[PDB]
């Protein structure tokens, strides 16, 4: 099985592109963890084939759940693909590491709060994806990860990246 990246970074750009996810990306690189972090402007109807391919060629995914993650149908389609690989891929598997960035993990797990609010903005053309999206969020939120709240963020990122390093080896 081809492996190009150690980590695929899933995130909601409008929330975290310039700040937390950028600092996390550079911290992973400083540990020699080959990371895919999209910085292209995406305006296609569907998920870009470059992204689907990067997920398939990653040893793991890190998910930066943030307040508006579920308001993007592209983030949710990304998550479904990640959780599909988590179930199917082998030699090696595809590990998943969720970060709950200033969001309650149970809100992700149960689609409450802003994660429940998000689904009201999806019309009937997405009706068939909504059950898969909910399933992927619940599965992801049950995996062991890191709830982040207010506190010194450089030390938060240091502990996360140290933990990913030890779990990949
Ligand atoms: N084709 C697309 N692919 C991925 N994300 C998109 C796409 N179109 C819109 N988005 C996301 O939805 C937001 C609102 O778009 P618009 O105002 O044009 O309706 C964009 O800033 C972007 O959020 P993000 O940058 O967090 O990925």
């Amino acid at each position: 099985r081809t492996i190009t990246y150690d980590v695929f970074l899933s995130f909601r750009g409008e929330d975290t592109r310039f700040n937390f996810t950028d600092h996390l990306y550079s911290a992973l690189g400083r540990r020699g963890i080959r990371t895919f972090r999209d910085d292209k402007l995406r305006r296609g109807e569907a998920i870009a084939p470059e992204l689907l391919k990067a997920i398939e060629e990653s040893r793991s995914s890190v998910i930066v759940f943030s307040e508006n993650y579920a308001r993007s149908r592209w983030c949710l389609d990304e998550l479904v693909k990640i959780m599909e690989c988590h179930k199917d891929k082998k030699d090696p598997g595809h590990a998943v590491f969720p970060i709950f960035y200033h969001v309650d993990p149970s809100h992700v797990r149960k689609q409450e709060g802003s994660f429940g609010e998000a689904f009201a903005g999806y019309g009937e053309n997405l009706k068939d994806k909504i059950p898969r999206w909910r399933t992927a969020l619940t599965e992801a939120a049950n995996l062991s990860g890191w709830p982040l709240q207010d506190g010194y963020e450089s030390n938060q990122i240091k502990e996360i990246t140290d933990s990913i390093f030890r779990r990949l080896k």
Side-chain angles (χ1 to χ4, degrees):
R1 199 166 86 82
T2 316
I3 296 300
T4 305
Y5 304 100
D6 297 311
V7 166
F8 176 95
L9 255 182
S10 184
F11 63 101
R12 177 74 208 263
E14 245 165 40
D15 292 339
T16 62
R17 157 192 298 120
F18 287 153
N19 300 283
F20 177 84
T21 296
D22 197 43
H23 297 297
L24 174 64
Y25 176 66
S26 65
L28 294 168
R30 289 196 299 277
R31 295 303 311 271
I33 298 171
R34 304 170 300 172
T35 301
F36 181 93
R37 189 278 316 266
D38 191 31
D39 46 47
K40 297 180 176 178
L41 182 65
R42 303 295 183 181
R43 282 310 179 255
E45 297 168 310
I47 294 275
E50 180 186 4
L51 296 197
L52 296 175
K53 177 193 195 213
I55 292 166
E56 286 193 354
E57 300 183 356
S58 293
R59 171 69 252 274
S60 73
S61 294
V62 171
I63 308 154
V64 186
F65 288 121
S66 57
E67 210 74 78
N68 296 306
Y69 184 97
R71 289 184 158 78
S72 161
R73 64 184 181 83
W74 299 270
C75 288
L76 294 176
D77 282 339
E78 191 168 85
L79 181 64
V80 167
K81 176 63 168 176
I82 288 166
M83 294 319 281
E84 253 165 21
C85 293
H86 177 76
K87 280 188 227 187
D88 298 320
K89 288 318 208 310
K90 291 174 65 175
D91 213 315
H94 187 88
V96 179
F97 310 116
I99 301 169
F100 304 100
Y101 186 69
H102 298 225
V103 297
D104 196 317
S106 71
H107 285 199
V108 180
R109 183 180 300 109
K110 295 183 152 271
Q111 295 99 55
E112 312 278 30
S114 76
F115 275 69
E117 270 220 44
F119 287 76
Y122 291 133
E124 195 164 322
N125 60 303
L126 294 172
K127 177 218 286 276
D128 298 331
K129 291 187 166 211
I130 287 169
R132 308 174 214 252
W133 287 345
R134 293 190 186 272
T135 291
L137 290 160
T138 303
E139 287 176 337
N142 285 328
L143 304 178
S144 295
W146 310 267
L148 297 193
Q149 287 299 330
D150 298 87
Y152 287 103
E153 188 172 271
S154 158
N155 194 77
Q156 294 172 340
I157 287 185
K158 182 189 161 63
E159 290 274 26
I160 292 168
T161 58
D162 286 357
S163 185
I164 291 166
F165 185 93
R166 298 188 293 265
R167 307 233 211 128
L168 293 181
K169 184 175 179 180

